[PDB]
């Protein structure tokens, strides 16, 4: 956590429903977007840290 | 009334998300009522799984 991993994601089909069904995640909290919308909304870039 | 896994207690609310809320038991966005739950491990679990 001093030196976290990072990746720019581009040019792909992002089906979040795998992660949305995998509710074994202790939290999955979103800001400025309701998580339901992520399969209907789309983006120029995504970054994963 | 029903039983769920404790992780799904999160899902029983107006406007909530995931497989219980979407596919097993759905509350309306303008629900008028109370939600109550309690741990039932000692009642509902079994040494070979229930």
Which residue is closest to B16 within chain A, CA to CA?
A: A36
Chain A CB contacts of B18 under 8 Å are 20-21, 23
Structure letter (DSSP) for residue B22: H
- How many Cα atoms within 13 Å fall on the side-chain side of residue B22? 8
Both tokens of A41, joined, read 């909304």
Structure letter (DSSP) for residue A48: E
Phi, psi of A46 (to 5 degrees): -125, 145
Please tell me the distance from the alpha carbon of residue B18 to that of residue B21, in angstroms, as a whole number.
6
Cα dihedral value A14, A17, A22, A26, nearest 10: 70
Both tokens of B15, joined, read 């406007």
Angle at B24 between CA B23 and CA B25, to 5 degrees: 110
Resolution for the entry shown, Å: 3.5
The whole-angstrom distance between A20's CA and the closest CA on chain B is 6
Contact A38, A16 (CB under 8 A): yes
Burial class (CB in 10 A: 0-12, 13-18, 19+), B11: buried
Which residue is closest to A35 within chain B, CA to CA?
A: B17
Method used to solve the structure: cryo-EM
Question: What count of other Cβ atoms lies within 10 Å of the Cβ of residue B20?
Answer: 20
Burial class (CB in 10 A: 0-12, 13-18, 19+), A36: middle
């Amino acid at each position: 956590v001093y030196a976290w991993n990072r990746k720019r994601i581009s040019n792909c089909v992002a089906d979040y429903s795998v992660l949305y069904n995998s509710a074994s995640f202790s939290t999955f909290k979103c800001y400025g977007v309701s998580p339901t919308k992520l399969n209907d909304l789309c983006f120029t870039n995504v970054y994963a840290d | 009334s029903f039983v769920i896994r404790g992780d799904e207690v999160r899902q029983i609310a107006p406007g909530q998300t995931g497989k219980i809320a979407d596919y097993n038991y759905k509350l309306p966005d303008d629900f008028t009522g109370c939600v109550i739950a309690w741990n039932s491990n000692n009642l509902d679990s079994k040494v070979g799984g229930n």
